[PDB]
Amino acid sequence: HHWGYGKHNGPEHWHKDFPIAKGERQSPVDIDTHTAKYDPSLKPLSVSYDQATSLRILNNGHAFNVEFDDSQDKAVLKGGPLDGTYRLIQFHFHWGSLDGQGSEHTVDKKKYAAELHLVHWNTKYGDFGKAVQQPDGLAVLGIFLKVGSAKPGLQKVVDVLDSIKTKGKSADFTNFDPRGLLPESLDYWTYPGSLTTPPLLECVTWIVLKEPISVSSEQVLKFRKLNFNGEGEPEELMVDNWRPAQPLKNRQIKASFK
Numbered sequence: 001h002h003w004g005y006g007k008h009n010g011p012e013h014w015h016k017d018f019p020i021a022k023g024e025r026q027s028p029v030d031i032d033t034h035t036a037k038y039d040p041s042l043k044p045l046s047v048s049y050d051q052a053t054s055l056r057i058l059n060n061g062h063a064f065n066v067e068f069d070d071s072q073d074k075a076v077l078k079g080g081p082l083d084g085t086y087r088l089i090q091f092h093f094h095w096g097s098l099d100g101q102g103s104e105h106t107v108d109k110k111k112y113a114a115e116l117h118l119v120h121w122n123t124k125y126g127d128f129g130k131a132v133q134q135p136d137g138l139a140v141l142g143i144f145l146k147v148g149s150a151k152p153g154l155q156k157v158v159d160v161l162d163s164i165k166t167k168g169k170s171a172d173f174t175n176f177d178p179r180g181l182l183p184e185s186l187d188y189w190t191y192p193g194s195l196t197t198p199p200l201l202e203c204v205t206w207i208v209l210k211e212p213i214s215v216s217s218e219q220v221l222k223f224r225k226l227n228f229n230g231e232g233e234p235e236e237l238m239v240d241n242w243r244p245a246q247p248l249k250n251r252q253i254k255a256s257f258k
């Protein structure tokens with residue numbers, strides 16, 4: 001894998017090694033709020049993170065992942081558009097070089113400063129690697145970030161980033177409560193899509209919350225001090241690690257709310 005977010009290896013190049021990049025259910029997409037249909041059959045989301053066990057934070061050269069113990073049903077997503085039980089494996093963000101870009105999904109073409117992805121896999125497939133081979137394998141909960149007031153529950157993440165500056169660095173990251181990253185409302189849009197990074201597998205039920213969270217300028221500035229490069233390599237700031245909106249094709253975006 002040599003894909004990334006540069007001019008020479010960014011999203012417009014990915015199709016050469018991952019031809020599904022041009023597929024029928026790629027993510028992210030623009031959410032056209034007036035075209036999304038309210039679906040009264042959609043259930044409230046059930047986010048059950050009370051027993052979540054965070055373990056570690058990793059700079060993987062594209063973003064940082066906060067990893068969870070997914071060896072039991074400890075932190076699960078169910079309800080909403082989903083059938084069955086999806087276990088939280090990791091969360092990460094996508095963000096920009098400036099506050100006017102960074103999100104992957106857009107809302108009426110609006111780009112947010114960043115987007116949080118809480119990644120869950122369907123327990124009926126047993127392991128994450130098996131789940132990504134299935135059309136209903138993953139559920140990703142997407143949350144927009146705007147710049148304003150600080151998000152108190154984000155600060156523990158911000159403060160460990162200095163210890164994982166470069167690709168391949170990890171740090172212990174226990175006892176982090178991801179409930180501190182949610183907005184007040186669980187109103188959402190949903191559609192069938194894909195992973196937004198290679199291998200771009202078409203295995204995701206996307207659940208994108210309408211209500212953004214607010215983070216401070218200082219918090220997002222610390223995201224932008226991370227590096228895509230490994231230790232001792234030429235410094236490349238980890239910024240603009242987002243894929244732009246892809247064609248909606250033969251898909252419907254449904255709203256949980258009127």
Ligand SMILES: NC(=O)[C@H](CO)NC(=O)CNOCc1ccc(S(N)(=O)=O)cc1
Nearest residue numbers: 117119128129132140194195196197199
């Ligand atoms: N684990 C596995 O057996 C293989 C090989 O390592 N991995 C994958 O086939 C997919 N890995 O997918 C990560 C991933 C990528 C993108 C997202 S996003 N940005 O759509 O939430 C969320 C997870």
Ligand SMILES: Cc1ccc(S(N)(=O)=O)cc1
Nearest residue numbers: 002003009013014016017
């Ligand atoms: C040099 C190079 C550029 C881009 C890729 S890709 N198709 O994985 O994005 C691989 C190698």
Ligand SMILES: [Zn+2]
Nearest residue numbers: 092094117196
């Ligand atoms: Zn993501």
